[PDB]
Amino acid sequence: NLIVPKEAATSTYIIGFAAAKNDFSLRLMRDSPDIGQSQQLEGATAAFQ
Amino acid sequence: INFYKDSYAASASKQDFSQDPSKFTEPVADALKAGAPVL
Amino acid sequence: INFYKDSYAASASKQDFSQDPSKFTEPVADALKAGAPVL
Amino acid sequence: SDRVLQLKLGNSAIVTQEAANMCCAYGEWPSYLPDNEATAIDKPTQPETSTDRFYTLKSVKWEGTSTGWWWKLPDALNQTGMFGQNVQYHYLYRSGFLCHVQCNATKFHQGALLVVAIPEHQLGKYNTGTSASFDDVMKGKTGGVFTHPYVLDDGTSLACSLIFPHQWINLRTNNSATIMLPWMNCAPMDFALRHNQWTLAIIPVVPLNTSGGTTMVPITVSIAPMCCEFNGLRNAIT
Amino acid sequence: SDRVLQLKLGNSAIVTQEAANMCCAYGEWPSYLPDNEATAIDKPTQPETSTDRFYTLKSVKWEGTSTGWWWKLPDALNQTGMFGQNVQYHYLYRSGFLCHVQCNATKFHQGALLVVAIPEHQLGKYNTGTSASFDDVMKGKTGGVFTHPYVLDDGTSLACSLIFPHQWINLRTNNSATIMLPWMNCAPMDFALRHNQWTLAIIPVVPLNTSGGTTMVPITVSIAPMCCEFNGLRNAIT
Amino acid sequence: IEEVMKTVANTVESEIRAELGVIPSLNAAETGATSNTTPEEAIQTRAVINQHGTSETLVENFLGRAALVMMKDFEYKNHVTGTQKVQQNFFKWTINTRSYVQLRRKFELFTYIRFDSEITIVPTIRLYTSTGASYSGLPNLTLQAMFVPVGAPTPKSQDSYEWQSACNPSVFFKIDDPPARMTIPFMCINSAYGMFYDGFAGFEKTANGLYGINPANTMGNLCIRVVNAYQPVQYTITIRIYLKPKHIKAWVPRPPRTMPYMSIANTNYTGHSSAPNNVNAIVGNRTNITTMPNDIVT
Amino acid sequence: IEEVMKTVANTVESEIRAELGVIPSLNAAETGATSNTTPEEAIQTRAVINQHGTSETLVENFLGRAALVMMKDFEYKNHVTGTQKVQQNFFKWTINTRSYVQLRRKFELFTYIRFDSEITIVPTIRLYTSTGASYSGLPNLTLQAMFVPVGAPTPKSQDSYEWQSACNPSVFFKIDDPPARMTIPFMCINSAYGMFYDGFAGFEKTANGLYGINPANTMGNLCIRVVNAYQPVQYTITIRIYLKPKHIKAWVPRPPRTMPYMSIANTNYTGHSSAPNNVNAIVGNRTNITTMPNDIVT
Amino acid sequence: SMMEINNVAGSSGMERLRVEISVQTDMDALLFNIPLDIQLDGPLRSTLLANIARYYTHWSGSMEMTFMFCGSFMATGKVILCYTPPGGSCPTDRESAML
Ligand SMILES: CCCCCCCCCCCCC/C=C\[C@H](O)[C@H](N)CO
Ligand SMILES: CCCCCCCCCCCCC/C=C\[C@H](O)[C@H](N)CO
């Protein structure tokens, strides 16, 4: 369980972290789905004037 | 094949297999051992 | 002629004349002789 | 000398006095996975005498109208013994197999069986576009029967299937067939519940003729896993 | 240095930061049966990473009126994991055990537990002539509770039970206890379903006092079989 | 054993044989072994120094030939007109090697093949025939073929922003140039490609839909577009992809396919309505087992 | 230390451990060090000789790929008609590498990068669709791309006299040729390019307008024109510039960008209206912390 | 790097990076679970691991998850963190999970 004294808070937090280890490897580089464009950015077309 | 005078014209140099995961994973003053209690 | 860095880019390797017809034609535990009665 | 044969594995043994020979597939012998080729890093379990032993399936009755029979070779054992239990508790499996087929008759009976082990026998369906269902292929220890053995239910041919490791059971000469199968896979190990490495097929190429003798002629299949090992222990799922 | 301890077995590991020490029963370590002492001649199966690993039982709630708890030490695992399956498929069993007991509290809680492993704890009954029934003793993974812990339910005494391998869990000092048990038997091996070599007993000699803090204080038992081997493979019986 | 065979075997001389206990021409097919009876012990042979080579029939030379793997046409116009708000001057293809039976049957002679793929892209162009179909020549358009691995975003328009391809490899090639060519490595997650998969691609036990689908045969997508903006006239672009394998290694030979293929996802069969290549009759029929169909009339 | 790693680490065998005072799986994240617990001391491992290479993921190979850096179209006609007295068959671009997010996010994984730039210019051409839009093929026009450093005069017309380029480097390339290619050196005034600048580009303390503008990122202008005089018909020229870095050196890795970009001059963020990639919720929502969204139904 | 284990509606900003552990009134209780996926949207998708890995298609090798307790000094507890190899459903009881 979580056991706490009478005067201590009964709720606490965990932080979780993750990582690779020294045997980890990646192959076949692609484009990440984490970003994308829909329109020209602000000032993008201003660079031509 | 590089027939240009300027060395920066050459192909890519994709050959540097040295690594140092320790500047990021263990950047501490006192080296941590294995199995020994950290602090 | 291969001027690419990756060895898989090379031409075909049509040069391996070794053969072993025996994994398919005689894949038995006891080797069969010639002229001797099989079983 | 090569007509008698005794196979011993764990607490099980089989003798035969009219064997033809022993077929070792592709001139190979089962062995454990070397460290050179392994990928899963956890320590494997290698039960030897509790898994590497003969399991005798139910017999099938050879009739005059029989088309043939097949067993998906891990799938046929997944529900059987300590092998099945290890298969259920572990994510990853690897083994060879030693397949022995028994069918005895008299000197007046006649007929021939093709005992052929087909690696990665992806089953086809006749006259339909939809693929085979889970039930059509995951028949378990019961096995299936061929619909069109002449094309191996695969659009290939029976005639060329002799390229695969095989033996015959010609009733005038021999009453048993034995084939030893190594690990067939691209991968070092596999999930035993969703992929079959081998199919043992029994096909009556020459039809049985009793000629007044005993009519109930059964075919019996005994399979022993070889060099079993398992990885990724967890809870049991069936 | 001796207050922190990590135990690793197969795919399971346990850490503790307030251990007292480790208790190795009678200065002994589990080991496989040597050929010098064996009697069954068939080749044993020795699953290592699938059986020699920690199994965490259900927790028990420590109350102010608690008398104590016990687990019959093979019997508690006979229905659990690959150990249980091997126990079911084999006539003969042998192992040690590594028993770890977890009970954590605060610096304001108080109480003491006697974690004692009793070899061949033949259970007695109070105020009756008839012996204990099968249900009274074969409690499985649930374990039992002591009726009269002061006589160990055995007409002996709790006070002298410190002759057996034991550890304490004093809430002001430590929150875990670990005892490692070798094979205790006259015989080289035994039928795991009708004889228990060890009883792990948890007895609250000093009663728990919450003193305004958290009231639900559970005790958790994790046991790992050590050097398991099995003989006499057959069908599974439960 | 293993022997190096640049040529085929010679024939040696043979002589009259009349021995007791020696039966070279007698075998036992039940053992699973092919007959070892050689011509010199079947008949009285002469010597023949035989210099017939075996190089043409090597597996590397048997499979190492470019064959059609994909072919697809699409319209090059302005599709924004109407109710369509997307330019759509492109197409997407999920890479498979089971679409065209010629290459497919040659690959399915083995269970596992490991090879690098030499890819050649052959574009053709025509001018659409409709009303004002006054020919004016074929424009020299530049095309972009982008490889899109599993999990990468896929373009939805000709003017999508997935076409920058910061990480996805692309080739820009023109109509009038030589065909585009690049090598894909052996890119399986296993040691070899499986031509056949006797299993399911999902951990979940669905009733149907996943038999024979190999989890490792998920090579991804090929997207090809026209870089140029639309012209006032419509053209039809046809893209043909040729695959040549190289550095080939093949294991476990299999019976060749005899029934016509029906799908790219399964081995389903129906055959023809009558022999040859029928589910009951692979070889054509002769009148009886005593009839030569092509007999010399002497 | 520094180790050369052609492959990844092997796994060694491991055995039962029950030691006092040894706690490999216990760490302290407050020190700022990542856990050093290895698999062999977490679980009982087998030996594995591991031959998985690490070359594909080198920084040189991670960044050394051509990506779109600029794309711009302009009209090729006679603009002198009307009230415009300047030919204007050209355009000017102020060089930046923050216009297209695919390359930008890959660069902003580091604070400083030193590289030479391999520049590839890909021209496309179309025929404008208006009235007499009778197709007659795409002309083989020659284009001039002139690099204009800071402080050099900049062309104001197609027929300006800045196009002699006695000192400014120029490339003359035709539509039907292969794309033009040249290497720009590492041309920063500092030892490396800064992807981020936490400061101001002016000595004067203006209220706003100069935060995040790096003084060294003033690479100058690229001016591209059509050398040919105007044709009787109007064409649209589209110029795409691809940048490939090479000889790359990267320092100080940074958290990847998660919010969509909004400008090329600042790191301003707004996110999406709902998860994923929202200012309050980068990862999408599940029902609760006890819910697998993709759970095998056994 | 931190995992958004608490990626639920209602949790905004930093609330997503931390998991509340509180005094239970039921033993053997399930606290949370983490979907071990990198391509799909999940707790791993916030890590630097998953942000570099998603630039590639294939991966191999062991990972690690580190958990940190940020309660008071006087709070004690014991938790078991179990990894289950694939093949079946997620364990919902501790007796099935500890296997
Ligand atoms: C710079 C790359 C852009 C062009 C990319 C072209 C991709 C086209 C590939 C078509 C054929 C790929 C074949 C790959 C694998 C094997 O053949 C299959 N798994 C069959 O086993
Ligand atoms: C003969 C030269 C004529 C063509 C000149 C082409 C110039 C186009 C250059 C575009 C990209 C230049 C990138 C230069 C520097 C760095 O990438 C930026 N400072 C970003 O840090």
Side-chain angles (χ1 to χ4, degrees):
Chain A
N1 201 353
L2 183 81
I3 299 96
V4 309
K6 253 71 154 203
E7 279 278 277
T10 56
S11 60
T12 62
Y13 293 96
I14 280 176
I15 303 297
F17 316 95
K21 285 280 159 275
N22 305 67
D23 64 3
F24 196 97
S25 44
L26 291 168
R27 289 195 329 178
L28 209 185
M29 152 144 41
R30 74 202 162 99
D31 262 292
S32 90
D34 295 308
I35 211 183
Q37 249 166 310
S38 152
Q39 60 212 62
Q40 288 287 2
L41 309 167
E42 257 148 8
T45 67
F48 297 97
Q49 338 169 30
Chain B
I1 303 182
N2 182 18
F3 285 121
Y4 302 108
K5 298 140 169 13
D6 304 280
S7 63
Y8 80 78
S11 310
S13 58
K14 51 171 184 171
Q15 71 214 74
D16 204 349
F17 286 100
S18 89
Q19 292 197 19
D20 196 335
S22 273
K23 317 208 288 306
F24 316 107
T25 65
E26 329 271 359
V28 291
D30 269 17
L32 310 174
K33 319 172 144 112
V38 197
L39 81 85
Chain C
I1 303 182
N2 182 18
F3 285 121
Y4 302 108
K5 298 140 169 13
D6 304 280
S7 63
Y8 80 78
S11 310
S13 58
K14 51 170 184 171
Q15 71 214 74
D16 204 349
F17 286 100
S18 89
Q19 292 197 19
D20 196 335
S22 273
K23 317 208 288 306
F24 316 107
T25 65
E26 329 271 359
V28 291
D30 269 17
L32 310 174
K33 319 172 144 112
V38 197
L39 81 85
Chain D
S1 283
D2 80 341
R3 328 216 42 227
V4 312
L5 165 71
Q6 158 147 348
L7 308 149
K8 197 197 39 185
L9 276 92
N11 59 350
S12 63
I14 295 169
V15 311
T16 178
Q17 290 163 226
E18 270 189 6
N21 211 295
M22 193 188 319
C23 174
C24 314
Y26 306 107
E28 217 81 44
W29 202 282
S31 66
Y32 292 115
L33 181 65
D35 325 306
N36 171 271
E37 298 179 325
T39 188
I41 75 172
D42 60 318
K43 176 150 142 120
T45 185
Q46 297 173 330
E48 291 123 1
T49 51
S50 81
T51 49
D52 316 348
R53 32 154 288 113
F54 279 109
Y55 296 109
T56 320
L57 308 182
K58 266 195 174 188
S59 285
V60 297
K61 189 205 189 286
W62 188 359
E63 300 221 1
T65 88
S66 272
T67 52
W69 309 267
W70 54 252
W71 290 269
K72 295 307 189 174
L73 206 54
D75 179 56
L77 301 184
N78 287 350
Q79 298 299 120
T80 300
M82 277 316 275
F83 178 92
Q85 294 302 330
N86 280 270
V87 161
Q88 289 168 221
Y89 280 89
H90 300 86
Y91 168 42
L92 291 177
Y93 137 85
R94 192 186 190 268
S95 75
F97 300 98
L98 171 65
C99 306
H100 185 75
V101 171
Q102 297 116 282
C103 175
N104 81 270
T106 51
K107 310 207 182 272
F108 291 77
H109 287 78
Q110 46 162 70
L113 295 162
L114 174 60
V115 182
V116 57
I118 304 164
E120 297 270 25
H121 180 236
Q122 183 178 345
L123 192 79
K125 301 288 295 200
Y126 175 60
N127 221 16
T128 192
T130 173
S131 301
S133 75
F134 196 88
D135 292 346
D136 294 333
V137 317
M138 294 303 198
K139 304 269 55 172
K141 69 190 188 296
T142 309
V145 303
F146 283 100
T147 324
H148 303 92
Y150 176 75
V151 299
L152 300 178
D153 292 23
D154 198 17
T156 61
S157 74
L158 179 57
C160 284
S161 70
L162 277 65
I163 193 57
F164 297 131
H166 68 285
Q167 282 223 310
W168 300 76
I169 298 180
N170 203 16
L171 295 188
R172 66 172 281 118
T173 285
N174 71 309
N175 59 249
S176 71
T178 165
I179 308 163
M180 171 145 69
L181 305 176
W183 179 246
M184 271 291 175
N185 208 354
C186 319
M189 300 191 79
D190 219 331
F191 182 39
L193 292 167
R194 295 279 180 285
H195 178 214
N196 298 297
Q197 291 73 28
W198 290 105
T199 299
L200 179 67
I202 313 299
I203 301 172
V205 184
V206 177
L208 171 89
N209 193 334
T210 278
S211 156
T214 305
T215 97
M216 209 264 300
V217 173
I219 299 155
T220 307
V221 180
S222 319
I223 295 142
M226 293 289 289
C227 302
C228 304
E229 70 204 319
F230 311 83
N231 279 75
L233 176 69
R234 48 153 172 60
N235 43 290
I237 45 78
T238 66
Chain E
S1 283
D2 80 341
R3 328 216 42 227
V4 312
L5 165 71
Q6 158 147 348
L7 308 149
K8 197 197 39 185
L9 276 92
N11 59 350
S12 63
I14 295 169
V15 311
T16 178
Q17 290 163 226
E18 270 189 6
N21 211 295
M22 193 188 319
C23 174
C24 314
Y26 306 107
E28 217 81 44
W29 202 282
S31 66
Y32 292 115
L33 181 65
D35 325 306
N36 171 271
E37 298 179 325
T39 188
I41 75 172
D42 60 318
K43 176 150 142 120
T45 185
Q46 297 173 330
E48 291 123 1
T49 51
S50 81
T51 49
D52 316 348
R53 32 154 288 113
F54 279 109
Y55 296 109
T56 320
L57 308 182
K58 266 195 174 188
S59 285
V60 297
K61 189 205 189 286
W62 188 359
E63 300 221 1
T65 88
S66 272
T67 52
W69 309 267
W70 54 252
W71 290 269
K72 295 307 189 174
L73 206 54
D75 179 56
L77 301 184
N78 287 350
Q79 298 300 120
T80 300
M82 277 316 275
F83 178 92
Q85 294 302 330
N86 280 270
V87 161
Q88 289 168 221
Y89 280 89
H90 300 86
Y91 168 42
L92 291 177
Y93 137 85
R94 192 186 190 268
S95 75
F97 300 98
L98 171 65
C99 306
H100 185 75
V101 171
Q102 297 116 282
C103 175
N104 81 270
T106 51
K107 310 207 182 272
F108 291 77
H109 287 78
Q110 46 162 70
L113 295 162
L114 174 60
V115 182
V116 57
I118 304 164
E120 297 270 25
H121 180 236
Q122 183 178 345
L123 192 79
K125 301 288 295 200
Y126 175 60
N127 221 16
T128 192
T130 173
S131 301
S133 75
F134 196 88
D135 292 346
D136 294 333
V137 317
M138 294 303 198
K139 304 269 55 172
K141 69 190 188 296
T142 309
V145 303
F146 283 100
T147 324
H148 303 92
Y150 176 75
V151 299
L152 300 178
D153 292 23
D154 198 17
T156 61
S157 74
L158 179 57
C160 284
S161 70
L162 277 65
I163 193 57
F164 297 131
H166 68 285
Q167 282 223 310
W168 300 76
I169 298 180
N170 203 16
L171 295 188
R172 66 172 281 118
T173 285
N174 71 309
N175 59 249
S176 71
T178 165
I179 308 163
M180 171 145 69
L181 305 176
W183 179 246
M184 271 291 175
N185 208 354
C186 319
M189 300 191 79
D190 219 331
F191 182 39
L193 292 167
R194 295 279 180 285
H195 178 214
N196 298 297
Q197 291 73 28
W198 290 105
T199 299
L200 179 67
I202 313 299
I203 301 172
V205 184
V206 177
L208 171 88
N209 193 334
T210 278
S211 156
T214 305
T215 97
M216 209 264 300
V217 173
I219 299 155
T220 307
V221 180
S222 319
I223 295 142
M226 293 289 289
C227 302
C228 304
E229 70 204 319
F230 311 83
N231 279 75
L233 176 69
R234 48 153 172 60
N235 43 290
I237 45 78
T238 66
Chain F
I1 68 141
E2 190 131 317
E3 58 270 45
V4 174
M5 296 283 291
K6 277 216 210 344
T7 44
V8 301
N10 293 348
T11 303
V12 301
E13 275 174 335
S14 187
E15 254 299 333
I16 291 182
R17 197 74 169 282
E19 263 334 300
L20 277 168
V22 185
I23 39 170
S25 321
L26 265 182
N27 300 103
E30 298 112 285
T31 65
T34 294
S35 54
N36 56 1
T37 309
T38 75
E40 304 94 336
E41 63 192 5
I43 62 143
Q44 196 166 347
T45 50
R46 66 166 292 148
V48 178
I49 288 72
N50 189 330
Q51 338 166 37
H52 295 191
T54 63
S55 36
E56 167 133 59
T57 186
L58 288 165
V59 178
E60 181 78 356
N61 207 243
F62 182 70
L63 294 183
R65 296 189 170 214
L68 182 70
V69 86
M70 179 262 271
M71 139 181 174
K72 159 83 161 173
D73 66 340
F74 63 101
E75 292 328 83
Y76 175 49
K77 42 185 283 270
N78 176 33
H79 315 78
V80 175
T81 48
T83 88
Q84 159 90 270
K85 296 205 164 114
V86 175
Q87 193 42 266
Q88 187 111 321
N89 275 285
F90 80 107
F91 72 88
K92 172 223 89 93
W93 179 59
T94 289
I95 299 165
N96 80 80
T97 67
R98 300 206 294 219
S99 298
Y100 293 97
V101 306
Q102 286 243 282
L103 175 63
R104 185 181 181 179
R105 184 177 188 257
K106 217 169 60 160
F107 276 176
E108 298 167 7
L109 272 164
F110 310 93
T111 311
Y112 313 119
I113 321 181
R114 178 187 181 103
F115 59 88
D116 308 309
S117 305
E118 184 149 278
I119 304 302
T120 308
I121 313 180
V122 182
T124 94
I125 180 140
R126 95 160 156 200
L127 170 62
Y128 199 73
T129 69
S130 41
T131 315
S134 86
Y135 193 72
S136 305
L138 310 174
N140 187 38
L141 320 161
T142 175
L143 311 154
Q144 191 201 338
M146 180 173 62
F147 189 87
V148 184
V150 191
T154 285
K156 279 324 182 63
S157 58
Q158 181 209 28
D159 50 357
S160 207
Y161 285 80
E162 271 106 4
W163 290 110
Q164 325 150 9
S165 70
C167 292
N168 282 343
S170 301
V171 61
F172 296 77
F173 62 104
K174 271 170 219 136
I175 296 293
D176 260 343
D177 278 357
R181 183 181 270 183
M182 70 297 299
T183 295
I184 313 303
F186 177 66
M187 64 165 288
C188 200
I189 66 177
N190 310 306
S191 179
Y193 301 121
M195 271 55 205
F196 296 89
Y197 189 68
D198 183 12
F200 301 85
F203 286 114
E204 249 196 344
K205 191 201 145 312
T206 84
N208 46 293
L210 296 160
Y211 186 62
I213 312 303
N214 207 317
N217 293 359
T218 316
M219 292 80 67
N221 296 282
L222 175 62
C223 312
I224 305 184
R225 75 157 166 163
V226 191
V227 181
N228 309 29
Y230 64 91
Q231 322 273 321
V233 282
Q234 166 194 1
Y235 296 91
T236 316
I237 322 300
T238 312
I239 301 296
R240 275 182 193 73
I241 308 292
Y242 290 85
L243 198 189
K244 169 185 157 198
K246 61 183 182 180
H247 314 139
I248 306 177
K249 285 197 191 108
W251 299 270
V252 199
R254 306 177 72 90
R257 176 93 177 192
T258 68
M259 304 293 102
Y261 291 106
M262 309 160 52
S263 171
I264 73 166
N266 39 52
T267 60
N268 288 17
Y269 56 93
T270 174
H272 283 122
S273 55
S274 60
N277 306 317
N278 163 268
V279 76
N280 293 318
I282 289 161
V283 181
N285 306 357
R286 57 173 160 158
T287 309
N288 39 54
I289 66 180
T290 39
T291 290
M292 301 279 156
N294 292 93
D295 203 24
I296 305 295
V297 179
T298 41
Chain G
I1 68 141
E2 190 131 317
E3 58 270 45
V4 174
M5 296 283 291
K6 277 216 210 344
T7 44
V8 302
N10 293 348
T11 303
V12 301
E13 275 174 335
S14 187
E15 254 299 333
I16 291 182
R17 197 74 169 282
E19 263 334 300
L20 277 168
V22 185
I23 39 170
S25 321
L26 265 182
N27 300 103
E30 298 112 285
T31 65
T34 294
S35 54
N36 56 1
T37 309
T38 75
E40 304 94 336
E41 63 192 5
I43 62 143
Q44 196 166 347
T45 50
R46 66 166 292 148
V48 178
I49 289 72
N50 189 330
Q51 338 166 37
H52 295 191
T54 63
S55 36
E56 167 133 59
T57 186
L58 288 165
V59 178
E60 181 78 356
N61 207 243
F62 182 70
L63 294 183
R65 296 189 170 214
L68 182 70
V69 86
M70 179 262 271
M71 139 181 174
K72 159 83 161 173
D73 66 340
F74 63 101
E75 292 329 83
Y76 175 49
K77 42 185 283 270
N78 176 33
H79 315 78
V80 175
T81 48
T83 88
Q84 159 90 270
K85 296 205 164 114
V86 175
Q87 193 42 266
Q88 187 111 321
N89 275 285
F90 80 107
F91 72 88
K92 172 223 89 93
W93 179 59
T94 289
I95 299 165
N96 80 80
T97 67
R98 300 206 294 219
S99 298
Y100 293 97
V101 306
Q102 286 243 282
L103 175 63
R104 185 181 181 179
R105 184 177 188 257
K106 217 169 60 160
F107 276 176
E108 298 167 7
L109 272 164
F110 310 93
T111 311
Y112 313 119
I113 321 181
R114 178 187 181 103
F115 59 88
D116 308 309
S117 305
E118 184 149 278
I119 304 302
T120 308
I121 313 180
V122 182
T124 94
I125 180 141
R126 95 160 156 200
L127 170 62
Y128 199 73
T129 69
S130 41
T131 315
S134 86
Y135 193 72
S136 305
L138 310 174
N140 187 38
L141 320 161
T142 175
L143 311 154
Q144 191 201 338
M146 180 173 62
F147 189 87
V148 184
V150 191
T154 285
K156 279 324 182 63
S157 58
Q158 181 209 28
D159 50 357
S160 207
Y161 285 80
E162 271 106 4
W163 290 110
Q164 325 150 9
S165 70
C167 292
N168 282 343
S170 301
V171 61
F172 296 77
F173 62 104
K174 271 170 219 136
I175 296 293
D176 260 343
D177 278 357
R181 183 181 270 183
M182 70 297 299
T183 295
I184 313 303
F186 177 66
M187 64 165 288
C188 200
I189 66 177
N190 310 306
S191 179
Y193 301 121
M195 271 55 205
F196 296 89
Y197 189 68
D198 183 12
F200 301 85
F203 286 114
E204 249 196 344
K205 191 201 145 312
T206 84
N208 46 293
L210 296 160
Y211 186 62
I213 312 303
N214 207 316
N217 293 359
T218 316
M219 292 80 67
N221 296 282
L222 175 62
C223 312
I224 305 184
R225 75 157 166 163
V226 191
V227 181
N228 309 29
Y230 64 91
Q231 322 273 321
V233 282
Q234 166 194 1
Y235 296 91
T236 316
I237 322 300
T238 312
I239 301 296
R240 275 181 193 73
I241 308 292
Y242 290 85
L243 198 189
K244 169 185 157 198
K246 61 183 182 180
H247 314 139
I248 306 177
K249 285 197 191 108
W251 299 270
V252 199
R254 305 177 72 90
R257 176 93 177 192
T258 68
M259 304 293 102
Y261 291 106
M262 309 160 52
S263 171
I264 73 166
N266 39 52
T267 60
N268 288 17
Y269 56 93
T270 174
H272 283 122
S273 55
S274 60
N277 306 317
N278 163 268
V279 76
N280 293 318
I282 289 161
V283 181
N285 306 357
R286 57 173 160 158
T287 309
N288 39 54
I289 66 180
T290 39
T291 290
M292 301 279 156
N294 292 93
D295 202 24
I296 305 295
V297 179
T298 41
Chain H
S1 291
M2 297 182 258
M3 308 173 80
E4 283 191 30
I5 304 166
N6 189 233
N7 58 328
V8 305
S11 287
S12 267
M14 296 199 289
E15 293 168 356
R16 296 180 143 242
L17 301 176
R18 63 187 184 240
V19 182
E20 187 225 271
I21 307 305
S22 49
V23 181
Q24 302 298 291
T25 56
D26 227 322
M27 319 173 244
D28 301 324
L30 168 61
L31 292 171
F32 63 85
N33 51 33
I34 290 160
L36 286 184
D37 71 81
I38 293 172
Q39 167 78 5
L40 268 38
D41 257 312
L44 277 166
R45 221 221 79 194
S46 65
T47 64
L48 189 68
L49 166 65
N51 276 272
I52 302 306
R54 271 162 78 109
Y55 272 111
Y56 297 83
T57 329
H58 303 168
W59 71 282
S60 155
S62 327
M63 310 186 274
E64 149 264 305
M65 285 157 54
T66 292
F67 294 87
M68 172 171 206
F69 184 60
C70 299
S72 63
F73 181 94
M74 311 274 297
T76 88
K78 273 177 209 235
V79 301
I80 177 153
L81 294 128
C82 321
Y83 160 56
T84 318
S89 106
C90 196
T92 69
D93 296 273
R94 199 181 86 195
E95 328 83 35
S96 314
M98 66 95 185
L99 288 177

